Curated annotation (Swiss-Prot), chain A:
From-to range in the entire protein, with total length: 3440 to 3585 of 5037
Subunit (UniProt): Homotetramer. Can also form heterotetramers with RYR2. Identified in a complex composed of RYR1, PDE4D, PKA, FKBP1A and protein phosphatase 1 (PP1). Repeated very high-level exercise decreases interaction with PDE4D and protein phosphatase 1 (PP1). Interacts with CALM; CALM with bound calcium inhibits the RYR1 channel activity. Interacts with S100A1. Interacts with FKBP1A; this stabilizes the closed conformation of the channel. Interacts with CACNA1S; interaction with CACNA1S is important for activation of the RYR1 channel. Interacts with CACNB1.
Family under the similarity heading: Belongs to the ryanodine receptor (TC 1.A.3.1) family. RYR1 subfamily.
Taxonomic lineage from the root: Eukaryota, Metazoa, Chordata, Craniata, Vertebrata
Name of the protein: Ryanodine receptor 1
Post-translational modification: The N-terminus is blocked. Channel activity is modulated by phosphorylation.
From Swiss-Prot, chain B:
Known role: Has the potential to contribute to the immunosuppressive and toxic effects of FK506 and rapamycin. PPIases accelerate the folding of proteins. It catalyzes the cis-trans isomerization of proline imidic peptide bonds in oligopeptides.
Tissues expressing this chain: Detected in heart muscle (at protein level). Isoform 1 and isoform 2 are ubiquitous with highest levels in brain and thymus.
Family label: Belongs to the FKBP-type PPIase family. FKBP1 subfamily.
Limits of the PPIase FKBP-type domain: 19-107
Protein name according to UniProt: Peptidyl-prolyl cis-trans isomerase FKBP1B
InterPro entries the UniProt entry points to: FKBP-type_PPIase (IPR050689), PPIase_dom_sf (IPR046357), PPIase_FKBP_dom (IPR001179)
């Protein structure tokens, strides 16, 4: 949520550049100027794998479709039904070979319950 | 003509009389040390009636001194082997052969 | 002409970790005896007869890599000139089997006891079979390196090593004067059966790649101290000559006072009541002043090492006192500490290192003296036989004795330090024990070129079993086997000893691993980057970048590559089973990377850098050496001239060059004994000729000209005609009277310095062979030399020159003829057996010795089982599941 509000605002980016310039934050020793080194994007980069972990590889396809949805700036609430209307997205683990080994690992995770 | 050299003794008692088939598993090599045949690769023992001259000569005075179960090495000179003609495509002319012969069963 | 193929068994070798050798002033006995009892042998488990030989081998070249090799593969004990073997009917060496009479000879069968002996005094290796002498003896062989017992075997055998004592009972008295082999285990190791040099051992989770191992050289048993004679004794030492002596006069006595070893007025030292703490005046005068001058002698070692003394602070004599403890109380003339007492005193690490090497130089002088009185080493002490368990150089001693020695001189240096006299460390000089063999240092295991990746995102893990010098990463397919990974531009690798990137050099990058760390290497060929993770955490450079390398061109491709140094183990998990990868999910999975082997149903084939010198053609593009195929004028026969491109230039590479011509000349299978040319002589001759012109400028003392058998694999950068392999197989009758004395080798050569005041004229060394007599002769410059060689029928011999360049015009092969002697081209090519015109067809080309070459790693290895069967049964070996290989034989080179 913080990141989408990050990208959806413009003057907020300039004010962030302000904070970094008047406060002389290293932005490197913290992680170990450019927006590349923004702690917002850095934190989301580091927190991303945890988020992607929930999404099974069989959901990787839906995502590729939803990429188009946010491209045309579709309404955030309606994406829900964009995904229940476009419901036949998840593919076949047998029909797709790479998924035959991704889905295995995802299936094995004790924290990932199919229920 | 044929030089028998015992590698592992057999029985030293029963020798192939004429007319007893001899089952022998063998491997053969030109004297320079290259192989042309083995029966062990084909996987079946080779049988021949001693006295019917199916086999080359040295192979026939040679597998006669062996006993049952013995393993020996024969060195057939071309006189008591193929000879000046050769087995074209297999054995060059004027060749001496060495055979690791194991007489497995008699008949 | 056509590459021959056949099915051959895999053959392996097992040895005890017992090494014995000989050198000047070596601390090793020279008469060794061991047995092998054959339990079961399946004579034909496959089509090929079961392999089983016993014998001795050398630690400087007996490396029987599984798979291919000399001849038709199946290299065991006796398939080179470093091993000496016996199979019951034959004596094997140099890949030649020579029949030996034994009383009732037959192949090694069940219930057989083979007793192998080594007298390294003459050098000799006798045998016995079932207690019956075997009439055949190897002799006069090379005595460099160390000798170990060895059995070679294919699948389908069971044998038992009998090493005597508690590792066997020998069933047969060793012949007089011989020592059982269990008396050669060094005081720091345990007797066990191991394979010879290996690049792979089975591990808990999977195969463990193994780097080279360090074996003891025969010069690691000679104690070489620093001479302590030419030392004028300084004034500051004689000034302290007494207290440092008084404090070590009964220091060994202090420990045992008030115990069962408590002194008594009736007796003296060495009477189970030793201490005698009173003084050294009561003790005998000769050993007394001997102890004084031994304290001086330790100070003299301090001088020769580079230790000097300086006095600054309050004199310790004042602020030190003697403590009449309740312990160490004695009735003989009062009680006192047995050594001279000392108060609170400390020692800096410089003193620790100094006392370590100071104790080393005490042990090594003692061992040298004992050896000079004839003594030698034995794990079991025999005083009347004059053998000791401690006659080894300090580096090989055990930690208990190391510490016991260090305690005394630590006390001495402590007493010296109390008096404030400085212990000065000497200068530091970095030295390398072995330098010549830079190539027997690193093994590089890479995936096969067929797996090269040009796209996608890939991942693979590498577990560092031993923190050491290992490099893991990605490598372009045309990787050189003889350059350190990352030194050139063909590899992007990570070195974990201290964290370093490697590509075209080194850059510090990341932490060093510890034992058990798992380095996950991953590549993204869409972004063209390489990432390394250490235990699931990305390694970051100092700049902050998360990619080790960026902007990598895809090029021809990339491969997994690993590089293990000496004594280094590692586990390469390419990921054929995803669950095996331990840190894949933590870093590597969600980012899109795939395991490198993900559906390689058959595990990924790997090739390693095989450090066995093979002869390979001189590259047409070579930075240093060029070969010109000069044709033949009327005065000059066809030639192949070697020139050094960069002589005088800054990047000149001057090193021994081992050249040979590609094709061999073969001797006749049966020997005859039992100017213008005469046409009938030249047509009916069997003598053949070739010369080598050593150009003016190239020193003739740096050239060796002659022949090599097809098993010369000796890339020796310090060559001489005493480093050529040799052996003398001697066959005798029952009494021992000789019947044959065949002499075998692999390098039949002459040194150009035998033939050579000013050097401006070339040296034309000519070589003649009589292919129907077996005799070889050399001509210096027209004059006939005095070195003749005799070779047995049917041998192959390549022309060869070994030259250390000393000029940009080095040598020149000359394929000409003499009067009534045919040229080489007649011997080499069948079509030219009667053509007396010298030729140089395109198949004749100079080849040079390459130190390393790539080689396939077998998919399946033999499964050998070793176990100490009992105190009386000895160590057992057992291989029973068969393995074959479809060989491919290059006929002219006699290799597989």
């Amino acid at each position: 949520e913080i990141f989408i509000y990050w990208s959806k605002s413009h003057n907020f980016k300039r004010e962030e550049q302000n904070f970094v310039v008047q406060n002389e934050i290293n932005n490197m020793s913290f992680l170990t100027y450019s927006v590349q080194t923004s702690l917002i994007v850095a934190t989301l980069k580091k927190m991303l794998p945890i988020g992607l972990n929930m999404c099974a590889p069989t959901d990787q396809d839906l995502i590729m479709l939803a990429k188009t949805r946010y491209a045309l700036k579709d309404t955030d609430e309606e994406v829900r039904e964009f995904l229940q209307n476009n419901l036949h997205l998840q593919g076949k683990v047998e029909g797709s070979p790479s998924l035959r080994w991704q889905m295995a690992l995802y299936r094995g995770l004790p924290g990932r319950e199919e229920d | 003509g044929v030089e028998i050299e015992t590698i592992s003794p057999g029985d030293g008692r029963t020798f192939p009389k004429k007319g007893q088939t001899c089952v022998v598993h063998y491997t053969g090599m030109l004297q320079n040390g290259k192989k042309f045949d083995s029966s062990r690769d084909r996987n079946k023992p080779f049988k021949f009636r001693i006295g019917k001259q199916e086999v080359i000569k040295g192979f026939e005075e040679g597998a006669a001194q062996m006993s049952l179960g013995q393993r020996a090495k024969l060195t057939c000179t071309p006189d008591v082997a193929y000879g000046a003609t050769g087995h074209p495509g297999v054995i060059p002319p004027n060749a001496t052969l060495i055979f690791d012969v194991e007489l497995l069963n008699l008949e | 002409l056509l590459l021959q193929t056949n099915l051959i068994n895999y053959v392996t070798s097992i040895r005890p970790n017992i090494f014995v050798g000989r050198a000047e002033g070596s601390t090793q006995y020279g008469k060794w005896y061991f047995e092998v009892m054959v339990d079961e042998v399946v004579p034909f488990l496959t089509a090929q007869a079961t392999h089983l030989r016993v014998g001795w081998a050398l630690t400087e070249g007996y490396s029987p890599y599984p798979g291919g090799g000399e001849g038709w593969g199946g290299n065991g004990v006796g398939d080179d000139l470093y091993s000496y073997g016996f199979d019951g009917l034959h004596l094997w060496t140099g890949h030649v089997a020579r029949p030996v009479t034994s009383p009732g000879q037959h192949l090694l069968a069940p219930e057989d006891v083979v007793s192998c002996c080594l007298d390294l005094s003459v050098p000799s290796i006798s045998f016995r079979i079932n207690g019956c002498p075997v009439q055949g003896v190897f002799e006069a062989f090379n005595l460099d390196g160390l000798f170990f017992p060895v059995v070679s075997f294919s699948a389908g055998v069971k044998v038992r090593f009998l090493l005597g004592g508690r590792h066997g009972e020998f069933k047969f008295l060793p012949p007089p004067g011989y020592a059982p082999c269990h008396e050669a285990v060094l005081p720091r190791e345990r007797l066990r059966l191991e394979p010879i040099k290996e690049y792979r051992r089975e591990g808990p989770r999977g195969p463990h790649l193994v780097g080279p191992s360090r074996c003891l050289s025969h010069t690691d048993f000679v104690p070489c101290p620093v001479d302590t004679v030419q030392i004028v004794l300084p004034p500051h030492l004689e000034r302290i000559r007494e207290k440092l002596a008084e404090n070590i006069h009964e220091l060994w006595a202090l420990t045992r006072i008030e115990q069962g070893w408590t002194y008594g007025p009736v007796r003296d030292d060495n009477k189970r009541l030793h201490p005698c703490l009173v003084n050294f005046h009561s003790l005998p005068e000769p050993e007394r002043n001997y102890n004084l001058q031994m304290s001086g002698e330790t100070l003299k070692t301090l001088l020769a090492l580079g230790c000097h003394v300086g006095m600054a602070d309050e004199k310790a004599e004042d602020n030190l006192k003697k403590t009449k403890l309740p312990k160490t109380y004695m009735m003989s003339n009062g009680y006192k500490p047995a050594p001279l007492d000392l108060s609170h005193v400390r020692l800096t690490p410089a003193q620790t290192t100094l006392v370590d090497r100071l104790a080393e130089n005490g042990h090594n002088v003692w061992a040298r003296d004992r050896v000079a009185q004839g003594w030698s080493y034995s794990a079991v002490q025999d005083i009347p036989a004059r053998r000791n368990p401690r006659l080894v150089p300090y580096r090989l001693l055990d930690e208990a004795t190391k510490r016991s020695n260090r305690d005394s001189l630590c006390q001495a240096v402590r007493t010296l330090l109390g008096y404030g006299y400085n212990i000065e460390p000497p200068d530091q000089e970095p030295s390398q024990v072995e330098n010549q063999s830079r190539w027997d240092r690193v093994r590089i295991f890479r995936a096969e070129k067929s797996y090269t990746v040009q796209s996608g995102r890939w991942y693979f893990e590498f577990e560092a079993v031993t923190t050491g010098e290992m490099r893991v990463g990605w490598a372009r397919p045309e990787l050189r086997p003889d350059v350190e990974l990352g030194a050139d531009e063909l590899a992007y690798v990570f070195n974990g000893h201290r964290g370093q990137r490697w590509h075209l050099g080194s850059e510090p990058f990341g932490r060093p691993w510890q034992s058990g760390d798992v380095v996950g290497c991953m590549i993204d060929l869409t972004e063209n980057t390489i990432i390394f993770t250490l235990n699931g955490e990305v390694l970051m450079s100092d700049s902050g970048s998360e990619t080790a390398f960026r902007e990598i061109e895809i090029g021809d491709g990339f491969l997994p590559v690993c590089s293990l140094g000496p004594g280094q183990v590692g586990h390469l998990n390419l990921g054929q089973d995803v669950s095996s990868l331990r840190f894949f999910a933590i870093c590597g999975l969600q980012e899109g990377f795939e395991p490198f082997a993900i559906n390689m149903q058959r595990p990924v084939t790997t090739w390693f850098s095989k450090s066995l010198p093979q002869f390979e053609p001189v590259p047409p593009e070579h930075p240093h050496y060029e070969v010109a195929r000069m044709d033949g004028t009327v005065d000059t026969p066809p030639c192949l001239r070697l020139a050094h491109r960069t002589w005088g230039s800054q990047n000149s590479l001057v090193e021994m060059l081992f050249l040979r011509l590609s094709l061999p000349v073969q001797f006749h299978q049966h020997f005859r004994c039992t100017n213008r040319d005469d046409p009938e002589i030249i047509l009916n001759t069997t003598t053949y000729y070739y010369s080598v012109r050593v150009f003016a400028g190239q020193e003739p003392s740096c050239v060796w000209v002659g022949w090599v058998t097809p098993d010369y694999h000796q890339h020796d950068m310090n060559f001489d005609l005493s480093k050529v392999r040799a052996v003398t197989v001697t066959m005798g009758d029952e009494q021992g009277n000789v019947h044959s004395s065949l002499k075998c080798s692999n390098c039949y050569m002459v040194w150009g310095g035998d033939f050579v005041r000013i050097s401006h004229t070339d040296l034309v060394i000519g070589c003649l062979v009589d292919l129907a007599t077996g005799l070889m002769t050399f001509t210096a410059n027209g004059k006939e030399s005095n070195t003749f060689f005799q070779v047995e029928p049917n041998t192959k011999l390549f022309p060869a020159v070994f030259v250390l360049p000393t000029h940009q015009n080095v040598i020149q092969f000359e394929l000409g003829k003499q009067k009534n002697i045919m040229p080489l081209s007649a011997a080499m090519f069948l079509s030219e057996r009667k053509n007396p015109a010298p030729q140089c067809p395109p198949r004749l080309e100079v080849q040079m010795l390459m130190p390393v070459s790539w080689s396939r790693m077998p998919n399946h290895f033999l499964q050998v089982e070793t176990r100490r069967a009992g105190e009386r049964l000895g160590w057992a070996v057992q291989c029973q599941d068969p393995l074959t290989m479809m060989a491919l034989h290059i006929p002219e080179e006699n290799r597989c």
